[PDB]
């Protein structure tokens, strides 16, 4: 299961990956799952969250 | 489309969201899409990437 970078991306944090268009990438499996941008109705705060940590 | 936090999560970076179990969350749509942990076969580097930036 291999992918390829459509555009350049420069990292904005210490945990993301910088790459250039054409690079070949493999998805790594982690226990955290996909990450989503979320808004907390409880706190009003907003930011990325690990999918597996929540349920509908 | 609302979810609820199964576990506490403490933020590790400046972009993720800290929350506590039971919090209610709403997914925000961004152009970047889901984020995945990836390994670059081209560079050997590893880190999170925005889904929409790549194709199989």
Author numbering:
A (entry chain A), B (entry chain A): 84 to 139
Which sentences did the original study use to describe this structure?
The non-receptor c-Src tyrosine kinase participates in different signaling processes by phosphorylation of tyrosine residues in a variety of proteins, modifying their properties, such as enzymatic activity, subcellular localization and stability. The c-Src tyrosine kinase is made up of six functional regions: (i) a N-terminal fatty acid-acylation domain, (ii) a unique domain, (iii) a Src homology 3 (SH3) domain, (iv) a Src homology 2 (SH2) domain, (v) a catalytic domain, and (vi) a C-terminal regulatory domain. Of all those, the SH3 domain plays a key role in the regulation of the tyrosine kinase activity through the recognition of an intramolecular Proline Rich Motif (PRM) and, additionally, through the interaction with other PRMs present in other proteins. To better understand the mechanism of 3D-domain swapping formation in c-Src-SH3 domain, and its plausible implication in amyloid fibril formation, we have solved the crystallographic structures of the WT and three mutants at position 128 of the c-Src-SH3 domain.
All the crystals of the dimeric form of the c-Src-SH3 domain belong to the hexagonal space group P6522 and show a single chain of the c-Src-SH3 domain. The intertwined dimer is generated by symmetry, and the structural motifs of the SH3 domain are formed by two polypeptide chains: residues (N-terminal)–111 from chain A and residues 117–(C-terminal) from the chain belonging to a symmetry mate (thereafter, chain B in the intertwined dimer structure). 3D-domain swapping of the polypeptide chains occurs as a result of an open-like conformation of the n-Src loop (Asn112-Gly116) which acts as a hinge loop. On the other hand, in the Q128RD, the longer side-chain of arginine displaces W3, while W1 and W2 are placed at the same position; and in the Q129KD the sole water molecule conserved is W1, which is placed at hydrogen-bond distance of Lys128 and Glu106. Thus, the amino acid at position 128 is responsible for the hydrogen-bond scaffold around those water molecules. Interestingly, W1 is the only water molecule conserved among the different structures: it shows very low B-factors and small ASA values in all the structures in this work. All the intertwined dimer structures described at this work show the presence of a PEG molecule at the interface of the two chains forming the dimer. Whereas the WT did not show a large pH-dependence of the Tm, our results confirm that: (i) the mutation of Gln128 to arginine or lysine, which bears a positive charge, results in the stabilization of the c-Src-SH3 domain, since these species unfold at higher temperature than the WT; and (ii) mutation to glutamate, which bears a negative charge, results in the destabilization of the c-Src-SH3 domain. However, at temperatures below 20°C, we did not observe the formation of high molecular-weight aggregates after several days.
